[PDB]
Amino acid sequence: EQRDPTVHDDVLELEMDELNRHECMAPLTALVKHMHRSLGPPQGEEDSVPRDLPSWMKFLHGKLGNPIVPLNIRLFLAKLVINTEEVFRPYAKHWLSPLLQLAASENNGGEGIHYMVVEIVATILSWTGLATPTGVPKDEVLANRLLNFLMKHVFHPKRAVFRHNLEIIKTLVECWKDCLSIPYRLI
DNA sequence: CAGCTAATGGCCATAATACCATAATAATAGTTTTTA
């Protein structure tokens, strides 16, 4: 690396067909699917690392540039099976994801902002008490900025195009808060 | 007668009238929205 699937934003600056046209996932999918049937209901992990470093899920990192994006794009349907806290740090990857990166991708396609955050957070609710992590330990700066941008954007595009689009977010908004970072006076 | 009347020739102000023409509001519908 880099390799072509690891050369990313060189083109394709909106998010639509990177899931459709990357032509990479589907093997990666059943890949981590079946070998995750090996590592799976056989054993779960409240931890990030033990499912990665021995896994090829370590190969997945998703930090620092385009090195971020596709890997965690990889995480997309990955976490479908993955959870629990096994994606613990990858979670931190996720709230990390939108910040200057989806920002770097900007609107990233009309439905893009969704396309990221949809399960960026919608995984946050993939658990209850495991969101005690989502709030407290490493979210430290994370969700604060996160929200800031998120909100910041999502205000208009409804204004730009049409309505309950945001509301889709307004949900997420709702979904957030049992304590969190309060960019709210700022709201 | 006396002087031609004197109501004849004319008719301007009016008030009335009209058309005729709006806000003070209060409606229509309206084209978008997805849903189906």
Swiss-Prot record:
The gene is PRKDC. Disulfide bonds: none annotated. It is linked to Immunodeficiency 26 with or without neurologic abnormalities: A form of severe combined immunodeficiency characterized by reduced or absent T and B cells, recurrent candidiasis, and lower respiratory tract infections. Some patients show dysmorphic features, severe growth failure, microcephaly, seizures, and impaired neurological functions. Belongs to the PI3/PI4-kinase family. It is found in: Nucleus; Nucleus, Nucleolus; Cytoplasm, Cytosol. DNA-PK is a heterotrimer of PRKDC and the Ku dimer (composed of XRCC6/Ku70 and XRCC5/Ku86). Formation of this complex may be promoted by interaction with ILF3. Component of the core long-range non-homologous end joining (NHEJ) complex (also named DNA-PK complex) composed of PRKDC, LIG4, XRCC4, XRCC6/Ku70, XRCC5/Ku86 and NHEJ1/XLF. Additional component of the NHEJ complex includes PAXX. Following autophosphorylation, PRKDC dissociates from DNA. Interacts with DNA-PKcs-interacting protein (KIP) with the region upstream the kinase domain. The chain holds residues 2070 to 2256 of 4128 of the full protein. It comes from the Eukaryota. This is DNA-dependent protein kinase catalytic subunit.
